[PDB]
């Protein structure tokens, strides 16, 4: 089974160190070669590094060189990415990909892991309703504010009926906390007559906030 | 040092449609190019290497072209599972480079948003902060626009938009725009509006309140 699995991704303060690994199977990593590529939240692909173990060859992207180091262990058939001096902009999902040939220029990146997320900020420190009153049937919500880190969990009634409903990708505020909202379109002459209850969760620190809405 | 200029940034198309994505390498990269496909929350998948060599397993509908330094990815007919974004890459230089991405979305109609403005809670006014919302619900296409307005005066620079991806059901969107400032900054003006312009609306829909 020729697969790629990547891990070691987590949260680290700026200037910290992390160190990723990419477990290789179903081929001989040493007979061939690898790449780490990465993806800042909501952006494009970015090449990070490469290695041909049996050429003892390694190469880097300028935006590192001197903070990251890429390696291999033949025993474990494994690749490593040692990142020191991590910044917030080094924040990104990091992937592996194999390259079937033994030098970066003779092949493209055929196989790829699932990518592990690396969030980097300097604080973990960490709600409200949005009441009902375009379309013809009003809408209401549940602004979820100032929590860390990613992500949250916003059902309604524990999901015993939920359609026409939207949880927005969170957005990063200058303060370093995220914020997203959930919203549901619900009929206009059907105000406050049966149920309509927001249900929230936040793993990292324990939370399951139930909230109500209306004039 | 080698830029790959991708085009277009986004593109709407229908099942059966033949689509073409282009990439201008800023200097000869001679055939050492690949195209990748990426679905949200998933790894990229290699489609074409060597500027036009079908990767094994990839559907023969996918295809790559190259003309000196312009590269085209063609999809002869466009099936459901092919809605995604696609990236070219050069690997002719030791600094590998990727293009910025083209989003390939489903071309359905011209349907218009439900707009709602939501007030900052009396609760959140008790923490010193003030957050106004503006909901653009269920629409196509994505090109839209919110103007956060206060007392007929568009004060913006303190607001951010979030958007859903095309949903599975009516493949529409949903936008969220939030506006933020002090409890002070809030307690000075009394009218608060967001007007939305969109090809589904004959003329922009203003939506407002007075706390």
């Amino acid at each position: 089974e020729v697969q790629l699995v990547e891990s070691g991704g987590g949260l680290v303060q700026p200037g910290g160190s992390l160190r990723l690994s990419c477990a290789a199977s179903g081929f001989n990593l040493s007979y061939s070669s690898m790449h780490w590529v990465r993806q800042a939240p909501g952006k494009g692909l970015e090449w990070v590094a490469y290695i041909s173990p049996s050429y003892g060859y390694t190469s880097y992207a300028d935006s590192v060189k001197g903070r990251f180091t890429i390696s291999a262990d033949t025993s474990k058939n494994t690749a490593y990415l040692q990142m020191n001096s991590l910044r917030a902009e080094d924040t990104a999902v990091y992937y592996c990909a194999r390259s079937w040939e033994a030098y970066w220029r003779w092949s493209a990146m055929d196989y790829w892991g699932q990518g592990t997320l690396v969030t980097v900020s300097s604080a973990s420190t960490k709600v409200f309703p949005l009441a009902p009153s375009s379309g013809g049937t009003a809408a209401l919500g549940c602004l979820v504010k100032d929590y860390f880190p990613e992500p949250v969990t916003v059902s309604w009634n524990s999901g015993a009926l939920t359609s026409g409903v939207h949880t927005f990708p969170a957005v990063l505020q200058s303060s370093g906390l995220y914020s997203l909202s959930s919203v549901v379109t619900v009929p206009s002459s059907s105000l406050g007559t049966q149920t309509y209850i927001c249900n929230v969760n936040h793993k990292p620190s324990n939370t399951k906030v139930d909230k109500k809405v209306e004039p | 040092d080698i830029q790959m200029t991708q085009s277009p940034s986004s593109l709407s198309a229908s099942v059966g449609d033949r689509v073409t994505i282009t990439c201008r390498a800023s200097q000869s990269v001679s055939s050492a190019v690949a195209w990748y496909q990426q679905k949200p929350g998933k790894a990229p998948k290699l489609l074409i290497y060597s500027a036009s060599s079908l990767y094994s397993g990839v559907p023969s509908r996918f295809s790559g072209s190259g003309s000196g330094t312009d590269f085209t990815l063609t999809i002869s007919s466009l099936q459901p599972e092919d809605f995604a974004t696609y990236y070219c890459q050069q690997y002719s230089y030791s600094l590998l480079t990727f293009g910025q991405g083209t989003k390939v979305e489903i071309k359905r109609t011209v349907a218009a948003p439900s707009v709602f403005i939501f007030p900052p809670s009396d609760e959140q006014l008790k923490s010193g902060t003030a957050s106004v919302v503006c909901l653009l619900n269920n629409f196509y296409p994505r090109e839209a626009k919110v103007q956060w307005k206060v007392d007929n005066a568009l004060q913006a620079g303190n607001s951010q938009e979030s958007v859903t991806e095309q949903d599975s059901k009516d493949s529409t969107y949903s936008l969220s725009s939030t506006l933020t400032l002090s409890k002070a900054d809030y307690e000075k003006h009394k009218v608060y509006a967001c007007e939305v312009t969109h090809q589904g609306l004959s003329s922009p829909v203003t939506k407002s309140f007075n706390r």
């Binding site: 190469s59 220029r105 | 000869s28 050492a32 002719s92 230089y93």
Partner: peptide
């Protein structure tokens, strides 16, 4: 003694490799 010899032969290694790249490119554009 340290990275002195080890980091040198590294540039030198990469230098050479960078030359071969040069060649592959100039064949591939004929």
């Amino acid at each position: 003694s340290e990275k002195a010899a080890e980091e040198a032969y590294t540039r030198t290694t990469r230098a050479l490799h960078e030359r071969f790249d040069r060649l592959e490119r100039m064949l591939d554009d004929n």
